[PDB]
């Protein structure tokens, strides 16, 4: 499990720790230890710096992915990057102080768009994007680490374990949350405004797929009401099948404690069917800690150096010592909180996403 960790742990870190400024600082203080690994190897390391130098290559990747994902976001010390051409244009003639919207010209080429920065409803769009991002990446991580169980049962040459645990697990996970992750992409694919159709809510689609089958208030695709019944029956048929295939075919191959196999398979079924719901909602910490990092890096900038920017007393000694003191107060707070005492929490959360959500499939 430490051979898929080598990319996914810095990347699940970077989804929570998304900023090209803090990411470049962390990459730089990691590359300082990578380039000086010969002078630091023959040295007595105390426990904290032994922890930091034993992982001098986990932090280099945690910085290198944080630069990539903070270039996907427009977040450079909580600022935007006007690198590409925007997909939104603002109106040219408008009254001062009124609320205006932007008209869509195209789509932004690489990453999120920079016309969402000083925006009232930009945080709603970032909530939707980062929530669905966390759902799809948790789905990808879980369905990637679930294939390793099949490779294990194939290397052990146990078709009984395959048909008892992998297949009823696969067509239970993919028939519910694979369908959710497909439905997010299919809602992103359709336009829903040019078509003059109502955009369906996907929360109360999965609520109503289990409560009221066949009733579709907002239709998302043609043949939805009869395919969701098939997916619901395929998910509900694997609750007795994953619970009753393996003990009843280990008992048939003795014609061994049947109580130690049946109770274990009941606990395995309850645990797996619980965890398929409990981990796709636990991967939303990739949105939680990303929102926390972005909002703290915004409200630290706005309290420290947004006060230092003024077109009055240009060149005065007081107005430049103001900028010096506020940059020092900003930089020590970014390093102390937003790097050391925030990225450690993002590191530990990407760690528990491996220890529980990935190393239990």
């Amino acid at each position: 499990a430490g051979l898929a960790t080598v990319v996914t742990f810095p990347f699940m870190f970077a989804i929570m720790f998304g900023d090209m400024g803090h990411g470049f600082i962390l990459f730089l203080m990691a590359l300082f230890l990578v380039l000086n690994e010969r002078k630091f190897g023959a040295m007595h390391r105390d426990e904290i710096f032994d922890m930091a130098f034993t992982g001098r290559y986990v932090l280099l990747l945690m910085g290198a992915f944080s630069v990539y994902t903070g270039l996907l976001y427009n977040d450079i010390f909580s600022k935007s990057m006007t690198i590409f051409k925007s997909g939104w244009q603002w109106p040219s003639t408008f009254r001062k102080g009124e609320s205006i919207e932007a008209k869509k010209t195209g789509v932004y080429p690489f990453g999120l768009d920079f016309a969402w920065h000083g925006t009232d409803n930009g945080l709603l769009f970032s909530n939707s994007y980062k929530m669905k991002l966390s759902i799809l990446m948790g789905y990808a991580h879980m369905t990637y680490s679930f294939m390793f169980s099949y490779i294990n049962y194939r290397a052990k040459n146990s078709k009984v374990d395959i048909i008892g645990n992998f297949i009823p697990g696969l067509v239970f996970m993919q028939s519910i949350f694979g369908y959710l992750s497909w439905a997010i992409v299919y809602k992103w694919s359709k336009d829903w405004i040019k078509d003059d159709k109502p955009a369906p809510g996907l929360l109360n689609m999965l609520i109503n797929m289990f409560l009221a089958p066949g009733t579709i208030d907002d239709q998302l695709y043609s043949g939805q009401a009869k395919l969701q019944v098939v997916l619901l029956l395929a998910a509900l048929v694997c609750v007795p099948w994953l619970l009753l295939y393996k003990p009843l075919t280990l008992r048939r191959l003795n014609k061994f404690n049947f109580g130690d196999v049946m109770i274990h398979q009941v606990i395995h079924t309850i645990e797996f069917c619980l965890n398929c719901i409990s981990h796709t909602a636990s991967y939303l910490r990739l949105w939680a800690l990303s929102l926390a990092h972005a909002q703290l890096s915004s409200v630290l900038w706005d309290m420290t150096i947004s006060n230092a920017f003024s077109s009055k007393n240009s060149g005065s000694p007081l107005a430049v010592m103001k900028v010096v003191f506020l940059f020092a107060m900003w930089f020590v707070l970014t390093v102390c909180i937003l790097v050391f005492m925030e990225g450690t929490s993002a590191m530990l959360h990407a760690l528990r996403l491996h220890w529980v959500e990935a190393m239990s499939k």
Partner: protein
């Protein structure tokens, strides 16, 4: 540790002063933002020079 903070004070404040000088819309483009660009760039670039003085003085330590 003052030389690290001073090197970042050179780089970050020089980029901020250049983005105020060229009237970049992530710094000037709002109503709550300052009106005159180079008036803010003139007092951020002097702070970049002050941190460069701190970087040169603490670079010989």
């Amino acid at each position: 540790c003052c030389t690290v903070l001073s090197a970042f004070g050179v780089v970050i404040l020089s980029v901020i002063a250049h983005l105020f000088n060229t009237n970049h819309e992530s710094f000037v483009g709002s109503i709550n933002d300052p009106e005159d660009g180079p008036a803010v760039a003139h007092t951020v670039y002097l702070a970049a020079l002050v941190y460069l003085v701190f970087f040169v003085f603490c670079g010989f330590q």
